[PDB]
Amino acid sequence: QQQQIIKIRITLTSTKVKQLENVSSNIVKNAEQHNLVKKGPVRLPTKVLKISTRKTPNGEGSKTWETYEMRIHKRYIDLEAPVQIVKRITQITIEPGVDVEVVVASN
Amino acid sequence: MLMPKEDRNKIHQYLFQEGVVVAKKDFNQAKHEEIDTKNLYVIKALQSLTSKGYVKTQFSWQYYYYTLTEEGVEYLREYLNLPEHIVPGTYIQERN
Amino acid sequence: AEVTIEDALKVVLRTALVHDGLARGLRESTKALTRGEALLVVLVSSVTEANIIKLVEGLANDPENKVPLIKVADAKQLGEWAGLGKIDREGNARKVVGASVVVVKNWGAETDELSMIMEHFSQQ
Amino acid sequence: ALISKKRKLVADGVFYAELNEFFTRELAEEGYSGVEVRVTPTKTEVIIRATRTQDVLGENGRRINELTLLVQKRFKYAP
Amino acid sequence: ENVWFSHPRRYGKGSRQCRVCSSHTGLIRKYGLNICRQCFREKANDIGFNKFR
Amino acid sequence: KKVKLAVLSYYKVDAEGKVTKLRRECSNPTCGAGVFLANHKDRLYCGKCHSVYKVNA
RNA sequence: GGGAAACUCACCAGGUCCAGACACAAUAAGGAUUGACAGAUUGAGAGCUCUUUCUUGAUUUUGUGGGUGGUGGUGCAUGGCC
Numbered sequence: 001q002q003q004q005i006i007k008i009r010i011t012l013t014s015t016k017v018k019q020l021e022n023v024s025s026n027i028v029k030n031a032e033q034h035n036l037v038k039k040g041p042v043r044l045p046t047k048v049l050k051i052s053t054r055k056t057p058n059g060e061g062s063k064t065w066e067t068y069e070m071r072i073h074k075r076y077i078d079l080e081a082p083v084q085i086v087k088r089i090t091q092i093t094i095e096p097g098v099d100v101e102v103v104v105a106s107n
Numbered sequence: 108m109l110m111p112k113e114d115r116n117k118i119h120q121y122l123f124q125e126g127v128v129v130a131k132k133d134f135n136q137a138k139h140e141e142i143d144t145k146n147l148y149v150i151k152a153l154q155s156l157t158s159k160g161y162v163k164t165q166f167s168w169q170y171y172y173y174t175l176t177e178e179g180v181e182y183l184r185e186y187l188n189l190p191e192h193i194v195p196g197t198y199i200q201e202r203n
Numbered sequence: 204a205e206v207t208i209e210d211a212l213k214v215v216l217r218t219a220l221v222h223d224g225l226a227r228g229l230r231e232s233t234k235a236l237t238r239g240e241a242l243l244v245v246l247v248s249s250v251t252e253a254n255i256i257k258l259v260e261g262l263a264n265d266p267e268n269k270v271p272l273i274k275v276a277d278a279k280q281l282g283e284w285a286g287l288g289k290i291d292r293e294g295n296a297r298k299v300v301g302a303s304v305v306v307v308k309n310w311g312a313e314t315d316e317l318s319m320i321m322e323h324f325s326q327q
Numbered sequence: 328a329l330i331s332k333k334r335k336l337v338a339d340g341v342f343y344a345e346l347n348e349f350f351t352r353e354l355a356e357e358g359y360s361g362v363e364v365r366v367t368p369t370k371t372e373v374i375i376r377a378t379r380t381q382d383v384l385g386e387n388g389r390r391i392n393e394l395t396l397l398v399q400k401r402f403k404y405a406p
Numbered sequence: 407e408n409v410w411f412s413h414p415r416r417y418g419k420g421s422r423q424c425r426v427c428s429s430h431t432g433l434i435r436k437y438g439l440n441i442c443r444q445c446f447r448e449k450a451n452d453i454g455f456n457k458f459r
Numbered sequence: 460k461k462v463k464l465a466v467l468s469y470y471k472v473d474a475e476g477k478v479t480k481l482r483r484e485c486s487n488p489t490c491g492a493g494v495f496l497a498n499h500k501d502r503l504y505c506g507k508c509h510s511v512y513k514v515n516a
Numbered sequence: 517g518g519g520a521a522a523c524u525c526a527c528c529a530g531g532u533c534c535a536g537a538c539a540c541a542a543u544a545a546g547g548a549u550u551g552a553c554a555g556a557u558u559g560a561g562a563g564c565u566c567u568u569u570c571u572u573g574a575u576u577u578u579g580u581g582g583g584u585g586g587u588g589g590u591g592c593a594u595g596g597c598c
Contacts, residue, residue: 051450168425
């Protein structure tokens with residue numbers, strides 16, 4: 001016997017917003033299309049990693065500065081899924097550039 | 108390089124067995140990853156092999172990438188005295 | 204011919220190199236005799252003042268165990284048979300030096316010619 | 328594991344830049360034009376895009392097995 | 407075997423170096439990328455550091 | 460600078476066939492009584508243990 | 517990206533090490549060569565060097581060609597960046 005519900009948690013973190021929203025939309029439809037219950041995709045505050053460096057390799061010139069930045073977007077979906085449907089949704093929704101981390105046991 | 112024959116055969120055994128060795132450009136490390144000699148013995152024995160054919164080297168971000176060639180495969184199946192059709196991973200791997 | 208005139212010795216020494224048991228040299232070999240590692244000892248005859256022969260003949264023929272020998276000449280041919288091949292179109296063309304004592308340890312191998320000279324010395 | 332998402336995604340970028348430099352040196356003759364890397368469960372995939380894959384692969388994939396071995400040694404993946 | 411070839415380098419500037427070019431001076435150690443400023447300026451689009459504002 | 464030697468013939472071999480181990484051997488477990496101990500000024504000293512085991516003798 | 521106690525460090529007063537590939541020629545298993553306790557010595561528990569006498573075992577040493585390294589020079593030989 002299989003299919004017990006466990007209150008699973010998906011965390012989706014990425015640097016490309018479109019692939020992240022495609023995978024989040026993927027999971028929310030792939031939960032609702034066969035009827036889980038969900039605390040749907042909660043947008044966390046997008047963190048901006050800034051690195052400020054001089055433009056020049058030597059020290060000559062007027063001091064010009066350069067602020068590179070990498071944006072990082074997170075989401076998390078709380079589902080209540082049976083362990084088979086857990087396995088199904090956890091293996092699927094792979095994307096180049098989206099990171100999925102799935103935890104159990106909401107205590 | 109002056110090094111023990113035990114360690115030179117350790118390097119050459121690992122190189123014939125693997126066909127390939129990565130090695131951090133870090134002298135005075137006292138332990139190579141996956142060989143139990145110095146890192147310097149690895150780097151210098153592989154260089155002494157490079158000058159006589161037998162292996163090629165790329166550098167690429169502080170990490171010597173050594174790759175055994177065919178002339179080397181002959182030379183150190185001769186040197187380790189294994190029978191023909193024994194080794195390095197010229198592999199026709201089952202699951203890959 | 205049809206037989207091999209101490210080239211059986213050449214073959215067991217050539218196999219004795221490669222699994223690390225051919226202790227060659229005077230000092231390396233007399234250090235092997237003074238512990239229980241010696242399995243087959245090979246000296247030579249044509250040396251000068253023969254205290255080297257005297258020492259290795261005393262230490263290999265103790266009246267305690269492990270007692271073989273052979274007295275074949277030509278330490279330089281014992282070098283071409285023992286461990287230094289610098290062939291280069293192997294009609295010899297090499298820089299060969301003499302060896303004059305060679306001692307075999309564990310001979311890591313098997314049958315025939317081992318057994319041939321083993322019976323040939325250790326049963327008369 | 329036990330790396331923050333800042334450090335993890337930065338190290339994923341640094342792993343991509345390292346792979347790109349290593350392949351720009353190793354496969355420059357075959358016209359290597361850029362990798363992409365896809366993490367999956369149990370496998371991380373490295374799609375080389377060269378133009379001359381008949382000389383990236385080799386005799387029954389002998390060359391790409393070396394590159395798989397090189398990358399799995401240097402970044403210490405399990406084989 | 408030489409115990410006269412070393413000296414403590416647990417910290418400072420000589421303890422660490424750029425992983426691209428082994429340079430000591432001018433590292434970027436933010437988020438542990440440990441590239442110097444000049445090689446970061448080249449590898450920045452590959453690491454994923456883009457110039458927006 | 461490696462002062463050379465004549466040979467190592469530091470055994471007293473008598474006539475037929477008794478040998479004797481002059482300069483008694485190292486007792487340490489990592490030196491299977493093949494190596495010798497040097498005798499400087501009372502200084503019994505092992506060379507295979509490259510540093511350790513200087514004996515008083 | 518220069519807020520340098522050591523490192524950085526490129527300067528000074530000194531001591532180590534070769535990390536001198538490869539090939540040739542020489543020496544040489546009657547040992548080519550490695551290392552070292554204690555003392556003198558040195559800033560130093562560096563056997564660096566010496567007394568000495570063990571160890572080591574073809575890896576190395578000596579000469580030639582030829583390499584490698586250099587925060588050495590020329591930014592008025594250049595790339596790239598600024």
